[PDB]
Design a binder for this molecule. Structure first.
Ligand code: BEF
Ligand SMILES: [Mn+2]
Length: 128
């Protein structure tokens, strides 16, 4: 993928945002911004130029499943890649996220190798 691709990393725990931002840097992606919940994320997205979203699920103000649905229903951003990264591991959560249009789903805790693999699977799927 394009190394200037602009990522938004969304999680209510700063620890996890830091993990994801550092992983992306190792992968050659330095154009990375953070948000603390779905509302904060939507505000950043509206400012424009984003090419990829990585999002938690459990967050105050707007949770990540609502964020994913909001993105998919909006004409300006409906095709935006969205990778879910969450501690929810039950099949019904995976199904609800997949059906709502998630590009990929990673269960926490995850390894560096798993994140890289799942990002690449999405790049290949979308011809990026
Ligand atoms: F809080 Be997340 F869904 F891991
Ligand atoms: Mn959370």
């Amino acid at each position: 993928a394009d190394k200037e691709l602009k990522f938004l990393v969304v999680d209510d725990q700063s620890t996890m945002r830091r993990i994801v931002r550092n992983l992306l840097k190792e992968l050659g992606f330095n154009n990375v911004e953070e948000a603390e919940d779905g509302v904060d994320a939507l505000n950043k997205l509206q400012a424009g130029g984003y090419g990829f979203v990585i999002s938690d699920w459990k967050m105050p103000n707007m949770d990540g499943l609502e964020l994913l649905k909001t993105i998919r229903a909006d004409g300006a951003m409906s095709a935006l890649p969205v990778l879910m990264v969450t501690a929810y591991a039950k099949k019904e959560n995976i199904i609800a996220a997949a059906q709502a249009g998630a590009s990929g789903y990673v269960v926490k805790p995850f390894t560096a190798a798993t994140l890289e693999e799942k990002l690449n699977k999405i790049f290949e799927k979308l011809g990026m």
